[PDB]
Amino acid sequence: IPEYVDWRQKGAVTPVKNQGSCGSCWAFSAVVTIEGIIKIRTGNLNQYSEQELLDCDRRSYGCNGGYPWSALQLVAQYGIHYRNTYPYEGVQRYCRSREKGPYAAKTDGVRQVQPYNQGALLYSIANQPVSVVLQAAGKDFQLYRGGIFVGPCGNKVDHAVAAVGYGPNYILIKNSWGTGWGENGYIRIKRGTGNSYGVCGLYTSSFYPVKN
Numbered sequence: 295i296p297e298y299v300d301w302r303q304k305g306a307v308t309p310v311k312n313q314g315s316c317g318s319c320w321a322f323s324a325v326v327t328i329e330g331i332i333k334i335r336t337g338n339l340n341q342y343s344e345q346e347l348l349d350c351d352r353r354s355y356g357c358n359g360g361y362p363w364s365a366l367q368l369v370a371q372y373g374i375h376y377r378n379t380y381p382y383e384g385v386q387r388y389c390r391s392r393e394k395g396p397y398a399a400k401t402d403g404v405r406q407v408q409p410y411n412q413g414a415l416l417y418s419i420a421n422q423p424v425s426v427v428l429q430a431a432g433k434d435f436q437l438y439r440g441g442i443f444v445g446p447c448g449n450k451v452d453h454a455v456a457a458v459g460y461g462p463n464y465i466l467i468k469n470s471w472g473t474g475w476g477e478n479g480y481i482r483i484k485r486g487t488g489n490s491y492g493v494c495g496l497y498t499s500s501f502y503p504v505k506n
Contacts, residue, residue, distance in 0.1 A: 295420035300459035300466060306333040306423065307458050308341050310479030312472035314384040316357035319454045321347035322470035323425045324365035326456035328374060330423035331505045332399055341377035342399065349389045356386030362425040362454045363501045366404040370503070373397025403504035410490045410497045416460055418502055423458045425501040426467070427451040428483070428494040435494065440477045444484045449495030457500075460485065465496065 301307050308329055313322050321344040333339045347354070347365045350372075354360025375391065376398045391397070407424060408414040418424045430436065430453030434446050442464050459466035464482035473479045483493050491497055 295417060298459070298461050299420050301330055301423050302458060304333075305339055306330045307468060308339060310468065310473045311344070311382070311470050313344075313470040316348070316384045316386075317355075317359045318344060318348050318357055318384070319470055320354055320360035320362045321345075321351070321365055323454035323456050324362045324369070325374075325377075326458070326468055327366070327423050327425050327501070327503050328369055328399065328401065330456075330458070331401065331503050334422055335505050340398065342374045343377050343380035343382075345377075345382045346375055346380045346389070346391060348386050350391055357384075362427075363404055363406070363499075366401070366425070366501055366503050369399075370401045370403055373400035401503040401505045404501055405504055407500035407502070409499065410492070412485055412492065412497065415457070415465070415492075415497060415500055416485075418500065419457050419460055419465070422502055423456050423468075425454060426457050426496055427454050427499045428467075428492075428496045429453070430494070432494075438476050438481055442482050442484050443493070444487075445493055447494035449491040449498065451495040451498045455481075462486075 353364040407418045429447045429450045432447045456468045467481045
């Protein structure tokens with residue numbers, strides 16, 4: 295795999311979003327991976343609906359948190375609509391999928407990256423954007439304004455994001471806190487520290503969609 299990967303550069307990443315005041319990170323994270331895999335497979339970059347996951351994944355808790363892998367299962371079993379068809383409202387409402395016509399896309403599966411293994415995650419990232427979790431509660435993470443983030447932080451994971459590349463000493467992550475946070479909405483998290491949890495517990499729970 296290459297020394298540098300950046301899915302943004304290959305046209306597999308849509309603009310940065312803002313989840314606002316709704317704990318829908320899980321849905322944002324999942325959608326990033328969905329958008330990436332469809333571009334990679336089909337050649338087209340689309341935006342897909344975080345709102346539909348929020349409303350429809352009843353295994354998750356709406357604006358109160360949820361599971362990226364639950365959301366990814368739903369898209370595998372049922373499918374997903376385009377973002378413009380089912381736009382983000384930042385509040386959980388009833389599931390409106392049927393009301394909105396046929397699904398725009400469907401994946402075939404969800405896989406787990408082997409946890410606590412940097413090499414396993416880089417390999418995955420080299421193939422497509424991956425759903426990853428980290429500890430974002432610390433003030434240091436929250437106030438991050440650019441550079442390679444090294445912490446401080448523990449491994450009490452609480453935020454789902456998406457990895458969209460890496461370099462010699464960092465993993466490139468797309469956050470869902472708007473373009474005004476970090477490096478235009480992205481963060482570079484130090485890698486290769488030999489900490490098996492990853493910085494801020496980044497190697498805890500990583501998922502990606504399978505599409506044939």
